[PDB]
Design a protein around this ligand. Structure first.
Ligand SMILES: O=c1ccn([C@@H]2O[C@H](COP(=O)(O)OP(=O)(O)O)[C@@H](O)[C@H]2O)c(=O)[nH]1
Ligand SMILES: *[C@@H]1O[C@H](CO)[C@@H](O)[C@H](O[C@@H]2O[C@H](CO)[C@@H](O)[C@H](O)[C@H]2O)[C@H]1O
Ligand SMILES: *[C@@H]1O[C@H](CO)[C@@H](O)[C@H](O)[C@H]1O
Ligand SMILES: O=C(O)c1ccccc1Br
Length: 444
């Protein structure tokens, strides 16, 4: 009971969730954990603190209003390095006289400066990669190549430019975030271990390639235990959400009154923003189906005029935020139109839901390529070359390809083999169970 992990996610939903889920595993194995949330995020969730994973607050420099009050992405990350470094040190020192001093920092790989804080205080330090081995390996190859990538990639020759992370195909876009994903590797060889939210059997080739460069420990998937290994009976869902929902049994009760495989689930995660015009094509494309579609509150104005008032309530429903785990487990879902965020993707693979892949940016085009051409668990929507955006007829056809055809009955078959592979990896003797045990052994 000696060790104590301070877990520091990037302050965004797709990072806090895998970090929190990992702390639940660690707790079940006997490791005390504290999750470090920025003050802005802490005051927006108003989390419940009567649980096994304690909360500390840190600062990113934007306590009052968070990321949106920052002038720019580069200012946000630079200020987060400054205030995050001091406030993480502040937590370490505050715990020094305690019963369990902090002994280890698990920090988002996006934040390599947290390793410097951990090393200053003599702690174990491990970066935690919330994206898959293939993506991280591609970034790693580019980092050692001075931030460039020339195709084809010898060890991954099937990758075309339209499949690389958006930073390589949209020249110059988001330079602060491109620098960030490259600099994940600035010091990661000096950490005690490198953690990845994937499982070895999902990406055998890429895990082994990347491990030659630096030993990594796959410790995923971070989907709650009740849906997979079922060894942690208290781990029943995602219980830190940055978004409010209508306390939705509303959503699951409704899915129950629908025929099996009949509903198209549409969601774009917590971050991705679609333009006026992209929302028009989408709204027209999906209205040919029975659909359950998450349109985040900030995105509603970009819906076509009078759209919310003309959805057939018998066949379709529009939500502000979904209990995505319960939706993807409900058998009313015939397919998942997704932005190919890594959590959504892994969730879809394990619940055996075939995908319509509609990536937008960052690592999402990589996940899309793997969904269609490596795992063969779905089809990618074709976007216009000159205008860049997927038109209504190409989205409707992609959904059809997954819902009905001969292509459809192949992708259902292949997508169901991943659940048991993950259950095996999480059960005793599994790949991921062994790696977690290795980490727990070092920490204490
Ligand atoms: O309406 C929604 C949309 C997303 N999610 C969850 O939010 C996470 C999104 O993470 P991902 O890596 O897919 O995408 P990002 O939001 O980081 O772009 C996932 O755990 C989803 O299950 C949810 O619960 N309800
Ligand atoms: C990275 O930059 C992009 C803008 O290009 C931001 O969307 C993102 O901010 C995230 O936005 C979410 C809400 O849509 C918040 O939940 C999240 O905490 C915040 O980090 C920047 O991270
Ligand atoms: C960065 O760019 C993509 C579209 O190119 C958008 O989906 C994100 O919301 C934005 O941050
Ligand atoms: O790719 C991601 O997960 C991501 C999330 C949040 C901010 C920036 C990025 Br580049």
């Amino acid at each position: 009971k000696r060790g104590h992990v301070l877990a520091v996610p990037y302050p965004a939903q797709g990072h806090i969730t895998p970090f929190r889920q990992f702390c639940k595993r660690l707790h079940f194995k006997g490791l005390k954990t504290t999750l470090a949330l920025t003050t802005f995020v802490f005051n927006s969730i108003n989390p419940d603190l009567s649980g096994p994973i304690s909360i500390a607050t840190i600062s990113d420099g934007y306590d009052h209003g968070g990321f949106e009050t920052a002038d720019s992405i580069d200012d946000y990350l630079k200020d987060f390095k400054t205030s995050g470094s001091k406030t993480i040190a502040d937590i370490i020192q505050k715990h020094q006289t305690s019963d369990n001093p902090i002994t280890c920092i698990v920090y988002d790989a996006f934040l390599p400066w947290a390793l410097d804080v951990a090393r200053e205080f003599g702690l174990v330090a491990t970066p935690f990669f919330t994206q898959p081995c293939a993506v991280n390996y591609v970034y790693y190859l580019s980092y050692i190549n001075n931030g460039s990538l020339q195709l084809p990639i010898e060890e991954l020759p099937f990758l075309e430019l339209q499949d690389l992370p958006s930073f390589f195909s949209v020249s110059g876009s988001y330079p602060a975030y491109f620098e960030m994903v490259l600099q994940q590797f600035i010091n990661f060889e000096k950490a005690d271990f490198v953690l990845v939210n994937s499982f070895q059997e999902l990406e055998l080739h890429e895990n082994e390639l990347w491990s030659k460069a630096c030993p990594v420990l796959t410790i995923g998937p971070t989907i709650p235990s009740i849906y997979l290994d079922q060894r942690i009976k208290s781990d029943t869902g995602y219980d830190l959400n940055l978004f409010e929902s209508k306390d939705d049994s509303f959503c699951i009760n409704w899915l129950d009154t629908r025929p099996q495989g009949s509903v198209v689930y549409v969601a774009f995660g917590s971050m991705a923003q679609l333009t006026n015009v992209q929302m028009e094509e989408l709204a027209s494309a999906v209205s040919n189906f029975s659909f359950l579609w998450v349109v985040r509150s900030s995105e509603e104005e970009k819906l076509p005029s009078g759209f919310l008032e003309t959805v057939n309530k018998e066949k379709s429903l529009v939500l502000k935020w979904s209990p995505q785990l319960q939706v993807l487990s409900n058998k009313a879902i015939g397919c998942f139109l997704t932005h190919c965020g890594w959590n959504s993707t892994m969730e879809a693979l394990t619940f055996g839901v075939p995908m319509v892949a509609m990536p937008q940016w960052t690592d999402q085009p990589m996940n899309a390529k793997y969904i269609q051409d490596v795992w063969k668990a779905g089809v990618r929507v074709k976007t216009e070359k000159e205008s860049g955006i997927a038109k209504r007829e190409e989205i409707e056809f992609s959904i059809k390809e997954v819902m009905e055809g001969e292509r459809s009955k192949e992708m259902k078959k292949n997508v169901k083999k991943w659940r048991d592979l993950a259950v095996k990896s999480l059960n005793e003797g599994g790949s991921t169970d062994t790696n977690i045990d290795t980490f727990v052994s070092r920490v204490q």
